[PDB]
Amino acid sequence: QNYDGSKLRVGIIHARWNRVIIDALVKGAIDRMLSLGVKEENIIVETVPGSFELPYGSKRFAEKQAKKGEPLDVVIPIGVLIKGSTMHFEYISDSTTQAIMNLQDKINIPVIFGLLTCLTEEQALARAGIDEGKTMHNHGEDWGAAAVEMATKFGANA
Amino acid sequence: QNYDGSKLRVGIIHARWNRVIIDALVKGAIDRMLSLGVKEENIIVETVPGSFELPYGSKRFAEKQAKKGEPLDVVIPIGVLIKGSTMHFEYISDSTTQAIMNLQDKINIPVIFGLLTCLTEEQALARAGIDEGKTMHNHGEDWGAAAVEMATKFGANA
Amino acid sequence: QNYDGSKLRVGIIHARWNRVIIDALVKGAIDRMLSLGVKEENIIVETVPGSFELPYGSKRFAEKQAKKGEPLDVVIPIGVLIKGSTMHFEYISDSTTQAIMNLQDKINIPVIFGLLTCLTEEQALARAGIDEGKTMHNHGEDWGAAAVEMATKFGAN
Amino acid sequence: VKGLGQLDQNYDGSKLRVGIIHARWNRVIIDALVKGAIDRMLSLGVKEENIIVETVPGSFELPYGSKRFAEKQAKKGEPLDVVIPIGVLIKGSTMHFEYISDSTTQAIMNLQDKINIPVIFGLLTCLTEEQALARAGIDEGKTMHNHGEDWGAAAVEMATKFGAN
Amino acid sequence: QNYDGSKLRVGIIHARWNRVIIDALVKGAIDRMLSLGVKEENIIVETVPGSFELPYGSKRFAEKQAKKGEPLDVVIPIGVLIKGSTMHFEYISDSTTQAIMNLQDKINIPVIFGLLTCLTEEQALARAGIDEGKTMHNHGEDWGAAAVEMATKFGANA
Ligand SMILES: Cc1nc2c(=O)[nH]c(=O)nc-2n(C[C@H](O)[C@H](O)[C@H](O)CO)c1C
C-alpha cells in the first residue's frame, strides 16, 4: 500500500554522539516522511545527549506534546552506538533497545527503532548512506516510512 | 490430537523483509490451518515493515479486530531475521522475542512465535521448506498447527 | 527434611519435541512425587507443542484448574531444547526462562523450571538418566522433589 | 561542600531482623557463605534470634522463595528488614548455568519493589569450583576472603540507611 | 543550548568498590554541574556498598528526599565494574543497567547511567580521566552535563 502522512504529527528525538552520522539518519527520515505527505511543520525534532537518554527522553517528549495539545502520532528515537574497547556498547544497546520496545505501551503510539548498533564506524556510515563507497542505503529513510505506515495503519483512529 | 479449528479466527501478521521466505512461511501456516478446519475467511492477514514492528502491530491488530466485533482467537507474528555484519540482528531478535512472549498477557490470547532468527539466508530457506535441497520442512506449518491447538485447548472457554 | 505431598495437587505440563527425553523426565518427576506421597489422581499432565508455549500454557492450565474447583498447588513446565545451527535455541531459551520465572507472581504458585537447555542430544539424554553410560541421575526427579518442597513450604496455607 | 567524602563508618544492626535463604546445591560452599554472612552481622550488632534462615532446593527457587519467606515473616508479625538469598552456580557443560543465572539475577533485582525491602545479591556465578571455593574463603590457598561477610555487611547497611523508618 | 542548572537539586549515589576511580567520576560530575549553575548546597551525595545496590538505593534516596520536602530533579548512580575471572561482572552489569533504565518511570525523574563496565582497571582509569597518559576524558563530566539537560528539558515542570 501507499500510506499518506498528511494528517500525522511525527516526533524525532536523537542523541548527539556521532553527530555526522546522526544528522544523515535524521535527514533521510525527514525527506522520506515529507515524500509521503507528512507536513514540514508537523515533524518535531528533539534531542538528548546519549542513546541511554532516548527512552525516557521519548516518553517525556510525547507527554509534553500531548499536554500542549499537539500529540505525536509516532516517535522515532535515533541513536548511533559503535562498539568501543569496553562492554559499554553492549549494556547501553541492550537496555536501550528493550526500553524503546516497552515504551510503546506506556505512551500508546508506535515507536520506531532508530538505533544503529555497529561494530565499526564504517558500518554506521554505510547504514546512513554516507560511506565513501555508498555501499548500502540510508536506514533513516526506512524509519521515516515505517513511522508513517505504523501511525496510519495502527493509530487510535485506525 | 485432532483439534477442530472450524470455530477459530486467526490473525497472521508478517514483516515484509525477506519477502519470498515470508510468503512461503505464511502460505505454510495457512494451509495447515485450513487442513485443521479453520475457514479461509477467518484467517486475517496483516503486515508491518520489520520484525521490530511485529509486537505493537500484533497488539493493535488484536485490539482493532475485537473492536469491530471480529476478535482474533490467536495471532501468529511472522518475521525473518538473518545475521548481518552489525549487532542489529541480535538486538532486534532478542527484544522482539521477549515482546512476543509478553504480549500474550496484554491481549489474553496465545501468540505463536513465528520469527526465524538465522545466521544465513540458506538456513532461512530450509526452514521455510524452500532451499534447493528440501532438507528440512516449512516451519510455518508448525506455527499454523500450534495456533489451532493453543486457541482450542487454552481458549477463553476452557 | 521429609516433605509430605499427600495433600498436593501438582500440574506437569510439557512440550512434545524430543519426546523420548520428555517422557523420561516426566516419569522421574511423577515417580519421585509418588514416593513423597503425592497421590496419582492429583498429578495432572497437560501438553503443548513447543517450549515457547510453556509459559502461556502453564498460565491457562492453572486458571482452568482453579476454575473447575481443582486448583494446582505447583506447576512443572518441562521442555527440551537442543542447540541447532540457527539462534532459535538461544531466543526460545532466554524468553521461555524469564517467562517461567515471571509466571509465579501471576498465578501465585511456585513454578518448577523443567527446561533442558542442551548443546547436544547426548547432554539432554544424560540429564534424563538415559544416555548409554548412565552418567547422571534423572533431573525430572529433582523437579518432582522441588515441586513438593516449594508447595509445602511456600504455599498459601 | 556537598553531601560527600569518605568516613568508612560502621552500621548498627541491632534493631534489624534479617532473612537468609539459601539453595542446597554445592552445600559446602553454601554453608561457608552463610556462616560468614551470619558472623559479620553478629559483629555488627544483629542479634542471633533475629537472623532467620530458610532454604530452597536450587537457585531458580530463590526469588519466589524469598518473596514467600518475607510475606510469611510479615504475616506472623516478624517482618524482615532485608533478605539475603544465597546460591552457588558453577558453569557445567550445557547452557543451564547461563539461563538460571540470568533469570535469577534479574528476578532478585526485581523482587525488591514487590516486597519493599532491600535484597542482597548472594549468588555466586563461577566458571569453576575453585573460583567458588575461593569466594567463600575456603580454597586450599585461602586466596581471597569470604564474600558471605560482605553480604552480611551490605544487608545491615541497606536496611539501616534505606529502611522505611 | 545553554542550560541553567541553578534551580536543580541533583542526587549522586555511588558504589564503594574502586573508590579512587569513583571519586574522580563524582568530582567530574559535580564540577560540571557547578559550571552549569547547579548550587553546591543542592548537590547531595549518597553511597551504597556495590553496584547491585544502586538501583534500589537510588529509589529509596529519591523517596527519602521527596518525603522531607527536598525532592531530587535527577539522580546519577555511579559505579565502577571491572571484569574478573568469574561471570559476576556480566550478571551485576546486566541486571543493574536494566534496573537503572527502568527506575526512571518508578520515581518519575531522569536517571543518568554512570556505570563503567570495563574489561580492565586501565580502561576505567582512562574513563575517569586519571590514567597515567590521560588518553580520554572524565566521563563523570558527561554525566553531570546530562543530568542538567535531562532535568531542565524533560522535568515535570516544563
Ligand atoms: C564481585 C563484585 N564486583 C563489584 C564491582 O566490580 N563493582 C561494584 O561496584 N560492585 C561489585 N560487587 C558488589 C555487588 O555489586 C553487590 O554489593 C553484592 O553482590 C551484594 O548485593 C561485587 C560483589
The burial class, CB within 10 Å (0-12 / 13-18 / 19+), for B114 is buried
Residue type (1 letter), D5: G
> Which residues of B are part of a known binding site?
51-53, 80, 82, 113
Length of chain D, in residues: 165
> Helix or strand or coil: residue D84?
strand
CA dist D19 → A58, C37, D72, E56 (Å): 40, 30, 11, 18
Selecting from A97, A102, A105 the residue whose C-beta is nearest the C-beta of B91 gives A97
Cβ-count burial of B106 within 10 angstroms (0-12 exposed, 13-18 middle, 19+ buried)?
middle
Collapsing DSSP to helix, strand or coil, B44 comes out as: strand
Neighbours of A53 (CB within 10 A): 28
Alpha helices of chain A — where are they, by DSSP H? 19-35, 54-67, 88-107, 121-126, 139-154
For residue A146, count other CB atoms closer than 10 A to its CB.
24
Q: Where are the domains of chain E?
A: 1-158
Q: How far apart are CA B42 and CA B33, in angstroms?
A: 10
Please list every protein residue whose CB sits less than 6 Å from any atom of ligand 1: D 120-121, 151, 154; E 15, 17, 49-53, 79-82, 88, 92
Annotated binding site of A for 6,7-dimethyl-8-(1-D-ribityl)lumazine: 51-53, 80, 82, 113
Which residues of chain A does B55 touch, with a Cβ-Cβ cutoff of 8 Å?
101, 104
> Resolution of this PDB entry, in A?
2.2
What method was applied to determine this entry? X-ray
Q: How many CB atoms lie within 10 A of CB B126?
A: 23
- Complete edge-to-edge strand list for the sheet that includes strand B74-82: B43-47, B10-14, B74-82, B114-118
Burial of A95 (0-12, 13-18, 19+ CB in 10 A): buried
Contacts with C93 from chain B: Cβ below 8 Å: none
Q: Which atom of ligand 1 is nearest to the CA of E52?
A: 15
Report whether D24 contacts D58 (CB < 8 A): yes
Sorted by sequence, the CB contacts under 8 Å of residue E157 that are 6+ apart come out as none
Q: Residue C31 corresponds to which amino acid? A: D
Set of cell numbers at residue E79: 559505579
Question: Which triple of cell numbers denotes residue C139?
Answer: 533431573
Residues near E41 by beta carbon (within 8 Å), at least 6 away in sequence: none
| Options 3.30.1330.10, 3.40.50.960, 3.40.50.9100, 3.40.50.720; CATH of C1-157 | 3.40.50.960
How far apart are the C-alpha atoms of A142 and B95, rounded to whole Å?
19
D129 vs C142: CA distance, rounded Å: 21
Q: b/e string for E83-100 if b means 16 or more Cβ within 10 A?
A: beebbbbbbbbbbbbbbb
- Other CB atoms closer than 10 Å to residue E24's CB: what's the count? 20
**C21: Cα within 13 Å, side-chain hemisphere:** 26
What is the DSSP secondary-structure string of C17-72? SSHHHHHHHHHHHHHHHHHTT--GGGEEEEE-SSGGGHHHHHHHHHHHHHHTT---
Q: Please give the positions of E annotated as active site.
A: 88
Specify the DSSP class assigned to residue E128.
B
Structural contact between residues A115 and A77, judged by C-beta atoms closer than 8 angstroms:
yes
Chains D and B touch each other (3 or more Cβ pairs < 8 A): no
Q: Best mutation site among E20, E83, E91 for testing chain D: the one with the most D CBs within 10 Å?
A: E91
Q: Which residue of B has its CA nearest to C92?
A: B97
Give the span between the Cα atoms of A131 and A129, in whole angstroms. 6
**Does B116 contact C85 at a Cβ distance shorter than 8 Å?**
no
Give Cα separations from D91 to A111, C4, D95, D132 (angstroms): 38, 33, 8, 11
CA separation for the pair C145, C29 (Å, rounded): 7
CATH no., domain E1-158? 3.40.50.960
User: Chain A residues with CB inside 8 Å of E112's CB?
Assistant: 52-53
* Residue whose cell numbers read 561542600: D1
- Phi and psi (nearest 5°) for D130? -55, -50
CB-based contact C117 D107, cutoff 8 Å: no
In this structure, what DSSP letter does residue A68 have? T
CA distance D20 to B86: 44
**Residues on chain A touching E127 (C-beta within 8 angstroms):** 86
CATH 3.40.50.960 assigned to D1-165: yes
Local structure of B128: helix, strand or coil: strand
Cα C44 to Cα C40: distance, rounded to the nearest angstrom: 9
C56 with C46: CB under 8 angstroms?
no
Nearest CA in chain B to C64: B158
Residue among D108, D150, D156 whose CB has most ligand 1 atoms within 8 A, to mutate: D150
| CB-CB contact of A47 with A152 (8 Å) | no
Calpha distance B73→B61 (Å, rounded)? 12
C-alpha cell at E76: 546519577
